[PDB]
Ligand binder design. Structure first.
Ligand code: HDD
Ligand code: HDD
Ligand code: HDD
Ligand code: CA
Ligand code: CA
Ligand code: CA
Ligand code: CA
Ligand code: CA
Ligand code: CA
Ligand code: CA
Ligand code: CA
Lengths: 675, 678, 452
């Protein structure tokens, strides 16, 4: 509603100033036709002042990201576990807006950097805006919010030269990770495929912190939020991610945009783990510690409702850039915990909007407005867009008949702090000793990945640590990695020419947990939206016919098909010059195009070797690949015909049926070497 | 209200955050009943953050002021002199918002400082917002906008100690005035009663600069804007103004507010002088020079329409504080001239809103919004409220079919610069010699005042210049004033114990012009809203009766009546403790209260001598005063007021008393009570 | 460093607040060891408030870039052609700071996008800061500054979805180019290897506009600035640039930084073409039109001096992010022309610094300060760092003895507008017909390239 009221249509009409005076804006007013521009040209100055002031500070973290509208629908009346109004009835719908992001990069940095990712969700509830400001990884680097600028200074570019962009592959970051062992768990997640998701739709969301569900009788339970993807879990490989950062920095935002435009809006089951207050230390670690997960073997997930994103913004700046999330946007039926990471966040997100917005009335921007009436005695401030009719904005008053009325647990559906909560003890700047195991869970996570996934994680660390210049930092990194796993430390040390420290088995173990592996999570549950590149030629009308035949068969099943040839024409979407294997989830060469794949093939229309390099890159990166028409191509690529995920069929139908199974498998991991 | 779409009502409902979450706001969340406050108390921090951020920079000038909504109505179809849409039909109405102000004082300074006054009018026209950003004085201190910081630094407080507030009565101001002779004309105005108007309703507004009216055929004429009060012109006296500043700093804003609430919303005829382009230098001065008026004897006023203010704001900060006027808010049919003061203003008022608002989307505030659609390619910026559908905001485009289309003289009702305008010559930083007579028009104004009015102007200068510490500066002041009038320099010099310099008659003359004198502008055309204090007593039930009878008779005629007595009760509005002569336009004592006027009278309920002081001050400041009931000698003798004085009334009959007293309210001030230099 | 006065050393000492109280910053203050954080924890709040407020708006264009300090050295006394003090003696040295950039991308976008590039140079002269705010391409896309938002909207990402980053390869850009044919000359330059230079050191810098040199006697000549690389000209190839954008988004800034650190600081000869006022239309186009070059065959380069960059910044944000260039930073001896693109720039760069800095005292930032005294009556404003002793900051005054004195052509080495300049005619919003050939110069350029 606040959005619809502020939509501005410029599909017709004459140009006006911001005060509705019709004007022009194409030629400056000058003293003669070859003369100096005049100060009295208000048309020039208003247009250029606006331009000059377009930009606002980027977000201090998560500067790079993209958003969409949708709806949350409750599966049930959840009154038995929370008073939350948005959860109080089967089928109850609440509008949402979600923004997804990286963490370290500035605006304009690439989507496919290796990083932690944001997953921030606003529920415009009938009892106020409720935000769950989460990440795609369920644990955080640090245990106390006061350390956030340390973490973030260390990962962001070195501040003398501002190098490197959007990367932890520098001395300072690994200096911090090695000195602050709490970082191990999130580190291991970021060095897995969770640091390079295939799309925002193929990752989960996590609140990280323990929160409370509070009932209308005052009782509480402890919860963790999990948003579980209905699209499946999928990652890129690092070598692919690096090329994609160059070829399409906008890959995740375009994937989102496109999925929504085609009627394939992504979905998640909004879930919780729910445990009793008495179980704060029962699972072998402290539920106040944001570097720990509750293994699902100890507390299963309950599905609360469906999150669907199905509408793109109208103006990115107004909606996506200006959305201002806060964990302080809480509603009756939810409460905080004493997680010292959460506790400090509550301060930060209120304060930082003053930086972004430049003034205190940021909740008035349409994307930040609620969908219920606002009744309070907040007044004035720069940018004040309301005209308040209550001329006695103080409590207690008689002159406004004691309105607005105080809301609390007893009346008015007020927020209230869970009334069972207490504090006791000295006023301290001390870390709880219950937070001191920094290594067991990183090992739990590592144990739960498949062998090739473990290899990819090792290889990520090998990559990044080999770029650390400091020999001491690199030694200190091995010291910490060795506390998680001696084998990781040895394997990583081998790439950097150092020896690993001797095994220290204090935290070693062989326990695993379900639901953290990407490679182990089975085939994708849908292939709709996945991209197939068909490599063809204009030389041979046979090639274009085969391509068209595959197109119809793949499109029917919701795949996005790109036919690539030397030059554009009817049925060809993309020239070889602009094509890359990073643009596809699977690649098919029509056998009529075989000539383009020869070592001597050359054209002024694309770079030498491009058609073959698309095919070979796709294969090396694990993708389903094949040749359709029943040979030259598989041999030019040194691609084995018997390999899993390599397809070779004369029959278009048999080809598509086999090829679509391989898109669901998504990645053929047998093509990656192990230690 | 014209801003009803933006109104928020809080007459019902439970307290919420700004995101609609019901909350409380009266107790902090604490770790135990006697414990420390918690960081997780979001209720506390959202509330206090908002409080901590309430303030915005005051305006760089005109910080002290007040506003109201109203309606402009055209008297005619003016399409034969201007294309301006708001003037294009008889009876055509346009919403307005007006803010009045002083100039030098900060927020919270007193309304009744001696100063220039602003009068800034927004017309929310059907072809865009059009602002006339004027003053109550028709001429400006300086002739080029680049000098404005110099002027304003010199008048504003000295920057080491920030003293004095809201006053030109200090060395720096008079240094600048004496060094920059352009200032003489506005200085003479500010030192007249125009520097201390009775109210905003009793002053005129002027655009100061020559502008252009431009027809749809592209022809132009030169115009001056003159908003002429239908309430009459009136001033305070200085001795009164000084007290009033202390007793009621809000006097002008309260007067306006009250007049609108009572259904007596003030009115002005919006008028122009209209002259041809060929007359730019025909009147003996340059029409580009903002230190000159065109005498009404050379060019008469044409009444274009009625401005009436009739609705107070709902939220002062949102509407009055935030209104951001600009002379760059111009409409088709009006154009600029090459007046160097005007030319630079155009820059300043767009820039300065960035300071006030903190971001570039200030035209989106409700009070600044137009009442017609906006179609342009301005985008983003902090605080962006709009959600623009056009995703191709560049010209020229095909992907948005070429919209928005360019508007100009021939299409779309565009603004256009008057096509007859030209420029010639070297690119220069020099002053036109046509601007060099700084002294003839100040003398024209002074010549046009009555003798008591001229004494008041001399006394204002005596007062201020006596507070200048520097003997140098004071001599330089006398040097400049002497160029306007030797008699002024002599009479000022006498108070400060210097000799005036020898006469220099270069610019002396005896010409006069109509319409600049307050004292000479004849009785007020209406007495509605004027204030009558009735001084009574609770000791005599007959004095209360007398007061009640006078109340009924005066209220019939639209006077604001206050009955004063020792204590409040039914029919008594104010105590002597809170009353003052600055609160009234006339003072009546009921003769049943004579005992309160004796030298010996004392009470713990009010300061010694308060009833009599009210009467004596009112008399000494020129107001109509009297005693009603027939026994007048005890009160008049205590006050040293002669029963036969002009504007002194004594009648037993309430009806006759009121008939006579009302004539005196229209006369307004009895100027025979002020001494003149021989 | 030239900014040594403002440096802060933290190689020793105990952690303090901003007001010098020693503190800690690693654990929050809590009501109990597993308790909630306390509002009275000022250590936490001061630290996190600073963090929360670290960012400032990126530049509206040229957001992605990097800078270095160096020195300019005059080859001669140029008194013959300009009163500019920095050019008045052989060997005269002036400190400089230079920032290089792309145009369209935001912060964090890749260095090796295909784009126009900035080359902005500040000379911290003994008669005031003088900036030449240039590009590596000598011509601009448009002929009137009022059009800049249109160009820039069209080349920046589409505003519904903010796609694509740092690229002209989208409908809106090519729509604008094809509807505004002025854009052809720059477009051909940007689609050449000049759009993907090998490094900032392997590109030239151009002022683009005609400016004036003005002598002390008031006479003037028309000039174009050229900064000619002593490293040579080199480009990437486009396939290579695309991969490099992914592998190393920081390639140009690293190349620069490393060159300086190794003692290979890059050099340019600072040159001008110098023609008479009477030649404004003599070359077959109008010297007021920023979409045209003067062919070197018509006016040769004169070498004025040497630009060498040889010192990297100490704090990128303080120095590089904060440097606020302006074409209005001009000195006696130089003047503007009536190029309608230049004319409107003069407004933009003073105004935009209010957005970036959030207040009016941005010339007080160390990187923006001049290296000579400041004497004026500018006062107050948010962030005011000066404590002004003159309590009579108005002119004309007696109470401060008439100081500061006015400076002009004849007194105090004032800036002055070239006194031969004039204007004639109607006040118009019309384009000179002398600007109308959008296509010959693009062809000239294309013809000058080799076959490959
Ligand atoms: C003490 C400070 C602090 C700490 C410990 C954290 N953050 Fe945060 N976060 C910020 C301070 C902050 C911020 C500076 O306040 C940001 C920048 C922009 C904004 O609105 O808030 C932000 C932004 C931000 C966003 C981007 C929201 C958007 O798309 O606009 C996400 C998703 C997260 N954070 C998620 C997290 C998670 C899951 C954390 C740990 C569980 C976390 N942050 C800890
Ligand atoms: C070069 C600068 C400059 C000059 C020469 C003037 N002013 Fe001005 N004026 C401003 C710069 C300014 C300003 C700094 O831009 C203000 C402060 C607040 C605002 O909106 O504009 C302003 C405010 C302001 C206001 C207050 C409007 C309101 O109520 O909000 C009035 C009535 C005037 N001025 C009137 C005048 C008149 C009649 C002038 C001469 C004919 C004049 N000003 C010259
Ligand atoms: C009407 C506005 C306008 C126009 C026509 C131009 N520019 Fe500009 N330019 C700006 C408005 C602007 C700006 C918005 O004012 C920027 C953003 C940051 C800043 O300081 O100024 C800017 C920044 C900017 C920078 C970055 C400086 C730095 O590194 O901090 C360079 C190098 C240029 N521009 C170069 C040019 C050249 C060579 C132009 C044409 C010859 C040009 N600009 C036309
Ligand atoms: Ca580093
Ligand atoms: Ca993986
Ligand atoms: Ca003084
Ligand atoms: Ca008077
Ligand atoms: Ca025009
Ligand atoms: Ca586009
Ligand atoms: Ca600000
Ligand atoms: Ca000059």
């Amino acid at each position: 509603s606040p959005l619809a009221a502020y939509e501005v249509d410029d599909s017709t009409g004459y140009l006006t100033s911001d005060v509705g005076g019709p004007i022009q804006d194409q030629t400056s007013l000058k003293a003669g036709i070859r003369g100096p521009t005049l100060l009295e040209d208000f048309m020039f100055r208003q247009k250029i002042q606006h331009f000059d002031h377009e930009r606002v500070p980027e977000r201090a973290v998560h500067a790079r990201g993209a958003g969409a509208h949708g709806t949350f629908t409750s599966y049930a009346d959840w009154s038995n576990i929370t008073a939350a109004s948005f959860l109080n009835a089967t089928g109850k719908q609440t509008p949402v807006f979600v923004r997804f992001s990286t963490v370290a990069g500035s605006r304009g940095s690439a989507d496919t950097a290796r990083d932690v990712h944001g997953f921030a969700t606003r529920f415009y509830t009938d009892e106020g805006n409720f935000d769950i400001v989460g990440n795609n990884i369920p644990v955080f680097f640090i245990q106390d919010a006061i350390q956030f600028p340390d973490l973030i200074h260390s990962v962001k570019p070195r501040p003398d030269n501002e190098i490197p962009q959007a990367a932890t592959a520098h001395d300072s970051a690994w200096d911090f990770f090695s000195q602050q062992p709490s970082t191990m768990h999130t580190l291991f997640w970021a060095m897995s495929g969770h640091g390079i998701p295939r799309s925002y739709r193929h990752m989960d969301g996590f609140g990280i912190h323990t929160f409370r569900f509070v009932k209308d009788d005052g009782s509480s339970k402890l919860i963790k939020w999990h948003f579980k993807s209905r699209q499946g879990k999928a990652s890129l490989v690092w070598e692919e991610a690096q090329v994609l950062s160059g070829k399409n920095a906008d890959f995740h935002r375009q994937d989102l945009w496109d999925a929504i435009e085609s009627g394939n809006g992504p979905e998640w089951d909004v879930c919780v783990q729910i445990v009793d207050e008495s179980q704060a230390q029962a699972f072998g670690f402290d539920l106040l510690d944001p570097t720990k997960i509750i293994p699902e073997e100890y507390a299963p997930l309950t599905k609360l409702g469906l999150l669907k994103l199905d509408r793109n913004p109208t103006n990115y700046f107004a909606e996506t850039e200006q959305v201002m999330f806060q964990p302080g946007h809480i509603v009756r039926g939810i409460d905080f915990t004493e997680d010292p990471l959460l506790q400090g966040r509550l301060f930060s997100y209120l304060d930082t909007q003053l930086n972004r917005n430049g003034g205190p009335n940021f909740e008035q921007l349409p994307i930040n407005m609620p969908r219920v009436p606002i009744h309070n005695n907040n007044r004035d401030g720069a940018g004040q867009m309301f005209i308040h009719r209550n001329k006695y904005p103080y409590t207690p008053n008689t002159l406004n008949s004691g309105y607005p009325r105080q809301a609390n647990q007893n009346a008015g559906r007020g927020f209230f702090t869970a009334p069972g909560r207490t504090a006791s003890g000295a006023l301290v700047r001390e870390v709880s000793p219950t937070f001191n195991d920094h290594w067991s869970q990183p090992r739990l996570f590592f144990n739960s990945l498949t062998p090739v996934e473990q290899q990819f994680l090792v290889n990520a660390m090998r990559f990044e640590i080999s770029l650390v210049k400091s020999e001491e930092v690199k030694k200190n990194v091995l010291t910490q990695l060795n506390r998680v796993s001696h084998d990781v430390a040895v394997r990583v040390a081998a790439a950097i020419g150092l020896g690993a420290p001797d095994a220290d088995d204090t935290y070693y173990h062989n326990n695993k947990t379900a639901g953290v592996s990407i490679v182990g999570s089975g085939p994708l549950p849908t292939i709709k939206t996945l991209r197939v590149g068909i490599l063809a030629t204009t030389s041979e009308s046979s090639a274009l016919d085969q391509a068209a035949q595959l197109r119809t068969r793949l499109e029917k099943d919701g795949l996005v098909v790109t036919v690539v040839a030397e030059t554009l024409r009817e049925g060809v979407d993309q020239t070889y010059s602009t094509a890359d294997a990073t643009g596809f989830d699977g690649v098919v060469v029509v056998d009529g195009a075989a000539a383009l794949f020869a070592s001597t093939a050359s054209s002024p229309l694309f770079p030498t070797g491009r058609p073959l390099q698309i095919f070979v890159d796709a294969y090396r990166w694990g993708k389903p690949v094949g040749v359709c028409g029943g040979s030259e191509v598989l041999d030019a690529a040194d691609v084995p015909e018997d390999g899993d995920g390599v397809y070779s069929e004369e029959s278009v139908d048999m080809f598509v049926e086999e090829f679509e199974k391989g898109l669901a498998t998504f990645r053929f991991t047998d093509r990656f070497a192990l230690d």
